[PDB]
Amino acid sequence: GSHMTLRIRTIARMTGIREATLRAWERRYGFPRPLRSEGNNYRVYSREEVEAVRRVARLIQEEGLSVSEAIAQVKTEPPRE
């Protein structure tokens, strides 16, 4: 009982071009935050990270500042279903 967790490989798959930004963020801020599980070369992630990330990534196609902006935004405005 709980949602399917996937890897940055899946999050990147959305357009590929994000992977340069996803791997950057790993050292640039830590978003999406790797869930505390198995995987060394690969990290695990939920749909709640993907929701924000998939937004941030498309937001980056509008200006790119959304790297720091939409991260700092989702840090101050966390998700709630």
Short mmCIF file of C-alpha atoms in Angstrom, two decimals:
data_model
loop_
_atom_site.label_atom_id
_atom_site.label_comp_id
_atom_site.label_asym_id
_atom_site.label_seq_id
_atom_site.Cartn_x
_atom_site.Cartn_y
_atom_site.Cartn_z
CA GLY A 1 0.00 0.00 0.00
CA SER A 2 1.90 3.04 -1.31
CA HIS A 3 2.82 4.51 -4.75
CA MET A 4 5.30 3.23 -7.42
CA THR A 5 8.84 4.67 -7.04
CA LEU A 6 10.98 5.11 -10.23
CA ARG A 7 14.54 6.39 -11.04
CA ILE A 8 16.01 9.64 -12.49
CA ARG A 9 16.26 7.61 -15.77
CA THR A 10 12.40 7.66 -15.87
CA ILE A 11 12.19 11.35 -14.81
CA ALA A 12 14.69 12.27 -17.58
CA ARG A 13 12.81 10.05 -20.17
CA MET A 14 10.11 12.81 -20.31
CA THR A 15 12.35 14.73 -22.82
CA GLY A 16 16.03 13.67 -22.19
CA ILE A 17 17.23 17.36 -22.11
CA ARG A 18 16.28 17.46 -18.37
CA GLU A 19 19.01 14.93 -17.40
CA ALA A 20 21.70 17.70 -17.59
CA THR A 21 19.47 19.73 -15.16
CA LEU A 22 18.50 16.71 -12.92
CA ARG A 23 22.21 15.69 -12.52
CA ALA A 24 23.05 19.38 -11.95
CA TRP A 25 20.39 19.73 -9.19
CA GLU A 26 21.81 16.65 -7.39
CA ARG A 27 24.88 18.88 -6.57
CA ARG A 28 23.14 22.32 -7.13
CA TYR A 29 20.19 21.99 -4.57
CA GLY A 30 19.30 18.27 -3.97
CA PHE A 31 15.85 18.35 -5.77
CA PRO A 32 14.38 15.85 -6.56
CA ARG A 33 15.51 14.43 -3.18
CA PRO A 34 16.67 10.77 -3.55
CA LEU A 35 14.42 8.51 -1.41
CA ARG A 36 16.26 6.57 1.36
CA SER A 37 16.40 3.10 -0.30
CA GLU A 38 18.61 0.77 -2.43
CA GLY A 39 20.33 1.84 -5.71
CA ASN A 40 23.87 3.33 -5.91
CA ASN A 41 24.37 4.50 -9.56
CA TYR A 42 20.56 5.08 -9.68
CA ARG A 43 18.33 6.81 -7.07
CA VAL A 44 14.62 6.23 -6.25
CA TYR A 45 11.84 8.86 -6.56
CA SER A 46 8.02 9.18 -6.22
CA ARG A 47 5.29 10.69 -8.45
CA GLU A 48 5.14 13.70 -6.01
CA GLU A 49 8.75 14.62 -6.96
CA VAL A 50 7.94 13.91 -10.66
CA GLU A 51 4.88 16.28 -10.49
CA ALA A 52 7.06 19.21 -9.35
CA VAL A 53 10.12 18.15 -11.46
CA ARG A 54 8.10 17.65 -14.70
CA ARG A 55 6.63 21.14 -14.09
CA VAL A 56 10.07 22.73 -13.20
CA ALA A 57 11.59 21.11 -16.34
CA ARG A 58 8.87 22.54 -18.65
CA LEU A 59 9.05 25.87 -16.71
CA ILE A 60 12.82 25.81 -17.60
CA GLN A 61 11.87 25.61 -21.32
CA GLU A 62 10.10 29.01 -20.71
CA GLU A 63 13.08 30.85 -18.99
CA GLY A 64 15.56 28.45 -17.22
CA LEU A 65 15.60 30.60 -13.99
CA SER A 66 12.88 28.11 -12.88
CA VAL A 67 15.85 25.85 -11.94
CA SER A 68 16.31 27.93 -8.75
CA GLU A 69 12.86 29.60 -8.84
CA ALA A 70 10.50 26.59 -9.15
CA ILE A 71 12.72 24.64 -6.66
CA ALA A 72 12.59 27.53 -4.12
CA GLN A 73 8.82 27.87 -4.91
CA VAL A 74 8.09 24.10 -4.28
CA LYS A 75 10.32 24.37 -1.12
CA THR A 76 8.03 27.20 0.22
CA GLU A 77 4.83 25.72 -1.44
CA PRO A 78 4.91 21.91 -0.77
CA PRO A 79 2.40 19.57 -2.56
CA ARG A 80 -0.94 18.56 -0.94
CA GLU A 81 -3.50 16.09 -2.30
#
